[PDB]
Write a protein that binds this ligand. Structure first.
Ligand SMILES: Nc1ncnc2c1ncn2[C@@H]1O[C@H](COP(=O)(O)OP(=O)(O)OP(=O)(O)O)[C@@H](O)[C@H]1O
Lengths: 181, 346, 388, 271, 134, 274
RNA sequence: GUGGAAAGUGGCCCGAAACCCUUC
């Protein structure tokens, strides 16, 4: 059940210290049995299409390690552009701090497409239609593994549209001292 | 089916939420029934309560004279707080007539009950023999029917079952009503009154129109069978307050669903042809038979009244000279000034 | 659409169904394997390019040894027996055990979900059970010989590969005894073992027998290890058209929640709970079997019919959940034990819930939840049993 | 096969019930917050539908070509033969009772009850074309309940049978005689020739409900609803798409004895 | 049948007449015993049913009907003593046990209290009712 | 292009409650509250509008030119897709309207306001129906109890035995504002006026028909009291200190908002227009 | 340049059947 941790149990979940797991996880992966209807008559057709569902005061966040000029020029206007119903969205910027020790080998914090450098990593498989024609499987490292033998795994160009879709996967470090391996 | 209900005798229909001596003020033999909510609401302001006085009604009852004439110390109105007035025929509690926004009316459930008793009477009378009862009781778990077959009529069967042992109320009350009006095989008494079998659901008895309050009064009651103190007074309708009523028959219920309806009334009314036609004549003639047989009991019960009074004789002389249907809404000694209680003609 | 193998080219071939949906060759072979799965006697491990090779492997293909054939690839994987019998003296007879039990249809083949949940005594819902043996990884860091490890693994695996078909078939009744009995345990149950092996076991079927199977498996396993080990079990009830991946991701989360919150506990039905860490979603087995010995024979008769007192007043137990929702929305208030008696006084049933009427100080002493929290897991399983 | 509506004639109700009203629940039926009496739509719709199909059960012998899909039935009852379809004008085992449901579309499209109260079953399930609003107590009686003068007075009956009358009583808590229930009723209008023989087919049922009861123990009172209409107006698609504050309004003088404003149905009407 | 601890529990409620700022188990732990004495005597429901309708109507007047129960609380206070005066013989010997609680409660609780203050009394009013049957 | 995201924000009063089901119970996500799922609002809001244009297809026919090859009907008699009656899309039992190509569904007035898919079509729905979530009056009402749902029992009364049977429903309490919202993309500025007039037409088909489950016998009768028409043209995102339209709020009846104040509300948005 | 794009948990259902607030 090692899924997610508090920050105070993350500055010392690395650096070889006895962290503690949390349990107040804001998930309701519920099984909403949606639509059944024909325009004239009955329809039976219970097709599920489950979704995620949150707590009373919770919400997603993500990070940004970059210069604030580039943030407020592209991403910060875009994070209020995003706000069938499941696009419910109100944006509130913030700052944060992480203790993050010496940078021999450390976390990626993203989904990751590495440059051939495997160190202790959950594998992922991410589809995505992305304007029509089905994107390939594009094997990924999951959220938070450790590839720090000088990463910089570039974004991958794809095919199918007029202008190319090119998929993310380039990562940013943190600080870990891992025991051995 | 608009019918007209004329009232022959004193008539009393009453809930049990009685009038209290905190409501009565007997004055000049005319009772002004008060409204104590408005009186309490207009006796604190520009008055007194001492934190207790208007809520001091754990005092003993009666004594209306002081209860107005000092609290109305030429300070309140005499009877503006009265909702209505009555007429004393005859200083304690009063049984209230069943009202509707302060207006008396005959409830149709009482009329339906006084008709259905007559329907039970003619159903046991003109069809109660063993060559009409056992033929139906054998169709519904006839272990009762072989006990019926020892007698030539179900009257002696129910006189047996009533005089049997283990008699409670819930099983022994409704059994004759079940045998007449339809039953169901259940493990309790080998039959059970499933009441949806009854053709009385094809009979509709509306509630009456509001009777006028100026023919509403309060009458004395004697019950001369015991030397117990009986200063009992009932709200009542004056004989002469001709009200209206609406009551009819659904032939479009029996005419469709004529198989599941069973029972001794249904068997006794299938005999007279189409049950849509003869049901109304059966209930009217059941009224005409039963409210004459009650007189037949009553014309020898005259010495059993206790008071051989000429009012009872002059009422019985007129009881069988009417152009409608006479009925009855409620030691046998209930009398209002000697007159009987609850006799109306329709 | 069938597999999540999810990267072929146009190699995928539509067959064995309505032939308009293109389908991977693995699941082309696999439904054909299922069509031989009742009559299958074993497999034969040969090279990948022989005759009759149904499935492949990393090194070797397999030939399905049916009831008459004679395959050979120098190894024969024979199912659920130790007598080789009618196989030649050239190949290596390799036995393997599989919990195989499944309800045959009128033909003899495997019943589907729609074929199974029609035999539900109550609502039409599919029961899904997913278990685990508890603290078993610590149990194999304590055996200090290859002999002890071999015995302690083989005796454990023989339960979840050979004993399961005995307990489903109705045996071991001399020690199982009074489990929660929703119905009569039939000759052929509506129980299909999907995957039982190693420690865990995953069994789908009709929920009225899934429920009895959970307690039968637990009490026979309590007999089988002599009480030194325990098993966790998640349970779930779904529609018959519910996808199997949600049907497993629900019971895996439920098994993990019953795993986290006491390690030896069943998850009978998903109940509402407050958020304070004092109300646990799971149930101890000595708690739940106690409760079903307490509240079920008072209010529930046998075979899908309610008790003669609650007969024709069958909307009574529904009102207790509406009562219990007040305790769910707040634990500190005290309206629940009052309105319970307000319900039970109106129907004359004075004695059927003596624990729910008076708030017990014994539970609020040691910060345990109130006795109306635990009874709804005994209510809803009766409420699913007599629903129409 | 088409729904194809253009229409929604509406009637604005006003059922001032006289001589009591007892609709039941778990006692009168106000579950929401403003404790009150109200008539919950479905108790009016079902009492309309069962009474109308009782009329059609006796009067099928003469329509019988008009509404042609009615001619697949008998005026009997499916009570003895306990099959879910028998060929009589009663089918559709709900749990133990029987209601009229045409299990097809095209047989329900012509049926004179089922074209106005909806089908169900295998693959068919006709939309009911009528919309029966929940009748809430009017603002006048709300203001006359805030000022005291209480509504929903109780009433006690007894079971005084023909035995020694130890009659166990039972309170009922009916609504007071005289209660404007602010009713509203909407009928979807589709394909005009299918229309004029529908609301004229509908009101007769309400006329029968004006003679019969609704709401509970109506064999001993508790009915007499008196649908004193208010609107009789019609809301075409010519302003649901473009709302210019215009409408085609009829007259609500007292009532109709038997369809006196049948001529005024088609006053400004083409759809 | 009846024993003196039960009118002494009634006397704890009547002499400790203040329950308004007390614990929500001080209500329920006494309300059983109160009703126990109230079911040790007869106290059939239908004469108490006139009281409870005045509670529920004023409870709806609490639920966004007005500011408080100022004038309508008197008829709640009046009708108790009215039922006491109406009660005769086998009832006034018994119904005063229900009477001796609501008058000394509603005495100071006709201080025009808050809706959150009166709700603590209405919960006790409901709290007496079910243990008639239990 | 994109010059879009009109926000219709409002409150929907269920005058007789709702029964958006899932005993049948309402959708209750994580706190025990009910809510209108935005799926059901969009779905009923397209059924009413699709049957409106089913009646009105033969006469518009020049405006919205792609809605001319239909000639009304359902394709359930001739069991095939792409049959020119009005609507094919056989899902499992049902038949809904989706234009099977993008080039057609740039002009079908229902389909270009709730989208199209199938094979090689992929039209986005141009609308975002946010789920409505129990505005802060009834949230604080719920905190002291107040019983936000209501168990309501109906029966199937027979006529030959007059028996009955419990069919409980558990609907939402009659009278509850829900904090209703609508977000709409305003691509293709020449389409926009008729588009939001059509969305207001479909919303005006509500308040006179059933939302939410077992309607036509009660259970529907909703009312949109929508306050603030907004606009987010292209400067609310690159900036957002100021400069967006806020319309009149208080007593805007939707059967009167549709045009009797709409062109007095349209012309301010004509002031930006870009 | 979003594991996407179109997808009302819907259709049908009287809380109904019977019951004198009255006797001793
Ligand atoms: N039949 C078996 N024979 C040998 N080893 C087994 C068997 N079943 C399970 N195991 C071992 O158990 C390990 C995982 O089991 P599991 O995680 O259930 O152990 P556990 O101690 O119960 O842990 P947890 O309580 O977290 O589930 C595997 O490494 C596997 O080798």
């Amino acid at each position: 059940k090692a899924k997610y941790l508090d920050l105070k149990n993350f500055e010392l979940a690395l650096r070889l210290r006895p962290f503690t797991i949390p349990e107040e996880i804001p998930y309701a992966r519920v099984d909403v049995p949606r639509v059944v209807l024909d325009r004239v008559t009955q329809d039976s057709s219970i097709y599920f299409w489950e979704e995620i569902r949150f707590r009373e005061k919770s919400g997603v966040y993500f990070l940004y390690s970059g210069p604030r000029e580039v943030f407020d020029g592209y991403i910060a206007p875009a994070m209020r552009f995003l706000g069938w119903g499941a696009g419910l969205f109100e944006v509130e910027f913030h700052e944060m701090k992480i203790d993050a020790p010496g940078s021999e080998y450390s976390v990626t914090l993203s989904n990751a497409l590495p440059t051939k450098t495997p160190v202790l990593w959950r594998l992922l498989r991410k589809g995505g239609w992305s304007f029509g024609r089905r994107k390939p499987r594009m094997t990924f490292i999951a959220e938070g593994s450790i590839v720090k033998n000088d990463p910089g795994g570039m974004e991958r160009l794809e095919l199918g549209l007029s202008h190319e879709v090119y998929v993310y996967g380039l990562t940013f470090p943190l600080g870990v001292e891992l025991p051995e391996g | 089916t608009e019918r007209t209900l004329k009232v022959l005798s004193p008539l009393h229909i009453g809930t049990g939420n009685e009038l209290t001596p905190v409501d009565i003020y007997p004055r000049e033999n005319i009772i002004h029934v008060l409204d104590t909510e408005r009186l309490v609401n207009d006796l604190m302001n520009l008055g007194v309560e001492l934190n207790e006085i208007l809520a001091l009604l754990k005092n003993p009852p009666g004594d209306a004279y002081i209860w107005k004439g000092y609290i109305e110390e030429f300070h309140l109105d005499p009877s503006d707080y009265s909702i209505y007035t009555l007429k004393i025929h005859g200083s304690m509690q009063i049984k209230e007539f069943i009202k509707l926004n302060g207006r008396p009316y005959i409830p149709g459930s009482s009329l339906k009950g006084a008709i259905r008793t007559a329907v039970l009477y003619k159903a046991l009378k003109e069809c109660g023999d063993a060559r009409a009862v056992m033929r139906v009781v054998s169709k519904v778990n006839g272990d009762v029917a072989r006990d019926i077959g020892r007698s030539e009529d179900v009257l002696d069967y129910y006189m047996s079952f009533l005089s049997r042992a283990r008699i409670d109320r819930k099983r022994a009350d409704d059994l004759l009503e079940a045998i007449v009006f339809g039953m169901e095989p259940d493990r309790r008494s080998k039959i059970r009154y499933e009441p949806k079998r009854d053709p009385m659901k094809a009979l509709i008895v509306r509630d009456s129109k509001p009777v006028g309050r100026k023919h509403l009064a309060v009458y004395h009651v004697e019950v001369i069978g015991n030397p117990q103190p009986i200063p009992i007074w009932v709200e009542a309708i004056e004989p002469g307050a001709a009200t209206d009523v609406e009551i009819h028959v659904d032939t479009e219920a029996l005419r469709l669903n004529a198989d599941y309806f069973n029972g001794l009334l249904w068997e006794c009314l299938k005999e007279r042809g189409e049950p849509g036609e003869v049901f109304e004549d059966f209930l009217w003639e059941a009224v005409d038979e039963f409210y004459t047989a009650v007189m037949k009991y009553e014309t020898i019960e005259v010495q059993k009244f206790g008071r051989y009074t000429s009012q009872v004789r002059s009422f019985y002389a007129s009881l069988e000279d009417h152009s409608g249907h006479v009925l009855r809404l409620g030691k046998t000694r209930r009398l209002a000034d000697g007159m009987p209680m609850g006799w109306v003609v329709l | 659409p069938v597999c999540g193998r999810e990267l072929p080219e146009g190699k995928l071939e539509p067959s064995a169904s309505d032939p308009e949906t293109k389908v991977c060759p693995t699941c082309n072979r696999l439904v054909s394997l299922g069509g031989n799965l009742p009559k299958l006697l074993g497999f034969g491990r040969t090279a990948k390019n022989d005759a009759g090779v149904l499935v492949e492997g990393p090194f070797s293909g397999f030939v399905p040894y049916l009831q008459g054939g004679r395959p050979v690839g120098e190894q024969i994987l024979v199912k659920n027996t130790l007598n080789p019998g009618e196989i030649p003296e050239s190949a290596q007879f390799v036995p393997y055990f599989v919990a195989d039990y499944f309800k045959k249809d009128p033909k003899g083949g495997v019943a589907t979900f729609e074929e199974l949940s029609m035999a539900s005594t109550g609502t039409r819902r599919l029961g899904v059970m997913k278990g685990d043996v508890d603290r078993l990884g610590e149990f194999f860091s304590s055996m200090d010989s290859p002999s002890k490890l071999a015995t302690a693994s083989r005796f454990m695996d023989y339960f979840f590969k050979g004993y399961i078909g005995a307990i489903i078939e109705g045996k071991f009744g001399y020690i199982i005894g009074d489990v929660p009995s929703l119905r009569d345990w039939p000759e052929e149950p509506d129980i299909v073992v999907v995957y039982a092996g190693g420690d865990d076991f995953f069994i789908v079927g009709a929920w009225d027998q899934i429920f009895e199977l959970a307690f039968r498996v637990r009490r026979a396993f309590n007999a089988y290890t002599g009480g030194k080990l325990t098993l966790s079990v998640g349970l779930g009830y779904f529609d018959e058209r519910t996808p199997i991946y949600r049907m497993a991701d629900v019971v895996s989360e439920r098994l993990d929640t019953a795993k986290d919150e006491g390690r030896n506990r069943v998850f009978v039905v998903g109940r509402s709970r407050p958020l304070d860490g004092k109300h646990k979603l799971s149930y101890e087995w000595n708690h739940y079997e106690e409760l079903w010995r307490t509240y079920a024979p008072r209010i529930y008769a046998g075979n899908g019919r309610l008790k003669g007192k609650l007969e024709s007043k069958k909307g009574l137990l529904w009102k207790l959940l509406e009562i219990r929702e007040l305790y769910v929305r707040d634990p500190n208030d005290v309206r629940w034990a009052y309105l319970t008696a307000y319900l039970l006084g109106r129907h004359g049933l004075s004695d059927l819930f003596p624990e729910l009427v008076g708030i017990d100080t014994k539970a609020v002493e040691r910060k345990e939840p109130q006795p109306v929290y635990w009874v709804d897991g005994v209510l809803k399983i009766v409420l699913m049993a007599v629903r129409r | 096969m088409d729904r194809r509506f253009y229409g929604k004639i509406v009637i604005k109700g006003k059922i001032k019930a006289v001589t009591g009203l007892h609709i039941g629940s778990q006692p009168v039926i106000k579950d929401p917050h403003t404790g009150l009496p109200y008539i919950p739509g479905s108790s009016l719709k079902g009492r309309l539908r069962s009474l109308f199909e009782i009329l059609v059960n006796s009067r099928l012998g003469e329509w019988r070509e008009k509404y042609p899909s009615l001619a697949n039935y008998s005026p009997g009852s499916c009570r003895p033969d306990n099959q879910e379809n028998c060929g009589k004008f009663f089918n559709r085992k709900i749990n133990r009772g029987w209601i009229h449901v045409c299990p097809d579309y095209e047989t329900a499209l012509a049926c004179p009850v089922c074209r106005l109260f909806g089908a169900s079953g295998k693959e068919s399930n006709f939309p009911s074309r009528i919309i029966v609003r929940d009748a809430f107590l009017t603002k006048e009686w709300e203001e006359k309940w805030r000022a005291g003068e209480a509504i929903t007075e109780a009433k006690i009956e007894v079971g005084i049978d023909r035995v020694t009358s130890q009659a166990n009583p039972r309170t009922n808590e009916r609504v007071v005689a005289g209660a404007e229930f602010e009713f509203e009723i909407i009928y979807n209008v589709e394909n005009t020739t299918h229309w004029r023989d529908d609301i004229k087919n509908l009101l007769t049922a309400m006329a029968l409900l004006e003679d019969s009861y609704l709401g509970g123990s109506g064999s001993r009172g508790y009915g007499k609803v008196k649908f004193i209409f208010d609107s009789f107006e019609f809301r075409p698609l010519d302003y649901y798409r473009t709302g210019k504050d215009e409408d085609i309004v009829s007259i609500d003088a007292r009532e109709k004895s038997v369809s006196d404003i049948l001529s005024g149905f088609d006053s400004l009407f083409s759809e | 049948q009846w024993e003196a601890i039960q009118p002494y529990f009634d006397n704890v409620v009547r002499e400790a007449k203040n329950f308004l700022e007390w614990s929500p188990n001080k209500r329920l732990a006494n309300a059983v015993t109160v009703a126990a004495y109230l079911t040790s005597q007869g106290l059939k429901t239908n004469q108490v049913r006139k009281i409870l309708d005045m509670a529920r109507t004023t409870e709806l007047k609490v639920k966004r009907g007005e500011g408080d129960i100022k004038d309508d609380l008197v008829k709640m206070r009046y009708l108790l003593a009215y039922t006491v005066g109406k009660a005769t013989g086998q009832s006034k010997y018994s119904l005063d046990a229900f009477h001796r609680i609501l008058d000394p409660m509603l005495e100071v609780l006709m201080g025009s209290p808050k809706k959150e203050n009166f709700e603590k009394f209405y919960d006790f009013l409901q709290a007496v009712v079910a243990y008639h049957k239990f």
